[PDB]
UniProtKB/Swiss-Prot annotation, chain A:
Organism encoding this protein: Streptococcus pneumoniae serotype 2 (strain D39 / NCTC 7466)
Binding positions for NADP(+) per the UniProt entry: 25-28, 48, 52, 82-85, 133
Keyword Magnesium attached: yes
Residue intervals of the KARI N-terminal Rossmann domain: 2-181
Cofactor binding summary note: Binds 2 magnesium ions per subunit.
Pathway this chain belongs to: Amino-acid biosynthesis; L-isoleucine biosynthesis; L-isoleucine from 2-oxobutanoate: step 2/4; Amino-acid biosynthesis; L-valine biosynthesis; L-valine from pyruvate: step 2/4
Gene: ilvC
Positions of the KARI C-terminal knotted domain: 182-325
UniProt name for this protein: Ketol-acid reductoisomerase (NADP(+))
Length: 325, 325
């Protein structure tokens, strides 16, 4: 069991008096740093020279290099892409850590799969808002926020959980709901969800439907609406009220078709396919494949991206979206 | 096929026409209210009284289905697919006159020939791609929902102009119209909802949820990873296709999408979809749906009760209760 937690469950204001460095100033970094400052926390930014550096000083943040920001900080939150974190950590963060420091991530990939090992006299925590940077910043400004997972990988000080929860509170997530997890569970469920369902499964399902229709001789423009455009309405309904609300709102013909045909398409064998996807997440195979592709100059990602640029549903879709305000 | 707009509606074919909307659910109310706002002469045909009264309250001349038809030049049937044949035979057909026009928002009954309209009467379709609530709402905002239009039989020579002018009257021509046939609209619409939008999607999500919970992961967290976070992804696809979605997610998620999507949705799944399409084309699904209705909805009953006991539905309801927005 696990109960959702809120501001009243943040027992200790553990970020009190802490010097906070956010590493990276992309959308994610910006949202965290800005939210914490508005909450009333001492935030500085650690990023390599460039546009983000300049914008960081434009926004009024004491901006330093990654190495120096880590030197100054009690709490260091690393918000950079997974594939560059190991290099960045080893070269700029690790030599500038001190005992009793705390290092945070928003996703557990590098820590869980042990591409990064933080010294054992240093806390490692996680606050993982379930939203993109701009939504994390915006909802905070509007007065609430985006819900989040929190976790602790290693607790050297005894303060790590309180730091994680206070970070969550500081970025607005505690205003709407928190769920405690582990680094292992967050990492494996997050990878599995996006691969089997949210991104991989979904786009593949859409593409397969589009192919069946267009290959059967139906017009691609019309197929676009029937497998893609109208999905927003459906998912918005599920988001708000689950399968129940969605199926109430659609016609009984559609509802009946849902019940009857859903299981013909997504079968036991498909569920087995998902189990194989989960297995390669648990055993480290996917993680190694991704890092290896990155190290090799992204050749698989390159081929995937150029292929996806040439999909008929993507060309037709671009034209149709152009033709609609 | 090219997208068409208000400028492509040559003739205001609904000019001087007495219009009856049959049915006053969300669909009926949306069409009727939009057309009245567009200045059309609209009456309502519906049984007493829990729809009849709401119609009268809204200020419509409201009659029985039989009497509304008798008065009307154009009759739009906006009742559940499964009850249209009975309603048409008993109340509508006896009150048609040559040169009348009968419309539908979905081609189910006409295409599968559960209903046969006399050869001196036009049969047209305007099929907005959204629920009634949405069709009315967007209209009030000075916007609209895109629509398909089609003609099944054209006795007067005016059927296409009638269909397009209906589309225009309900606000659809403000955003975009696509011409189709009754056959392609019916078959593509049934296939999309069954294989992808509703059936495929809910089954995909449920399978993901099962895999996670059966592997020992917490269901609260599984809810977010296969359902809650899907809205963000689909909003991105709605706005900019697979391309925009995959630009916006992490490179880790994007790579996982490309690699695991095809592992889950395979050639065999595509074959499963082809079987779904076939049972739509050959009329087997249509007969199954109507036969379930005639038998007192026993399959729908069992399906609905099973769906109410889904763990993802119970957990999701409790989680959505714990979250405001």
């Amino acid at each position: 069991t696990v109960q959702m937690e809120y501001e009243k469950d943040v027992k200790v204001a553990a970020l009190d008096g802490k010097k906070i460095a956010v590493i990276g100033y992309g959308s994610q970094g910006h949202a965290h740093a800005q939210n914490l400052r508005d909450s009333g926390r001492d935030v500085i930014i650690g990023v390599e020279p460039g546009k983000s550096f300049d914008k960081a000083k434009e926004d009024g943040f004491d901006t330093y290099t990654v190495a120096e920001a880590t030197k100054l900080a009690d709490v260091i939150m690393i918000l950079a892409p997974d594939e560059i974190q190991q290099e960045l950590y080893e070269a700029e963060i690790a030599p500038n850590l001190e005992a009793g420091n705390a290092v945070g991530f928003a996703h557990g990939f590098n820590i869980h799969f042990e591409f990064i090992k933080v010294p054992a006299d240093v806390d490692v925590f996680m606050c993982a808002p379930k939203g993109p940077g701009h939504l994390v910043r915006r909802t905070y400004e509007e007065g609430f926020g985006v819900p989040a997972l929190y976790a602790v990988y290693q607790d050297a000080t005894g303060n790590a959980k309180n730091i994680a929860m206070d970070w969550c509170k500081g970025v607005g997530a505690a205003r709407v709901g928190l769920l405690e997890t582990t680094y292992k569970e967050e990492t494996e469920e997050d990878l599995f969800g996006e691969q089997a369902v949210l991104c991989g499964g979904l786009t593949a399902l859409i593409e397969a439907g589009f192919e069946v229709l267009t290959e059967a001789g139906y017009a691609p423009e019309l197929a676009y609406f029937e497998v893609l455009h109208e999905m927003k309405l459906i998912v918005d309904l599920i988001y708000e009220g689950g399968f129940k609300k969605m199926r109430q709102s659609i016609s009984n013909t559609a509802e009946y078709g849902d019940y009857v045909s859903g299981p013909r398409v997504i079968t036991e064998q498909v569920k087995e396919n998902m189990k194989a996807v989960l297995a390669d997440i648990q055993n480290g195979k996917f993680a190694n494949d991704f890092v290896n592709d990155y190290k090799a100059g992204r050749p698989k990602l390159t081929a995937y991206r150029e292929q996806a640029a040439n999909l008929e549903i993507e060309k037709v879709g671009a034209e149709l979206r152009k033709a609609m305000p």
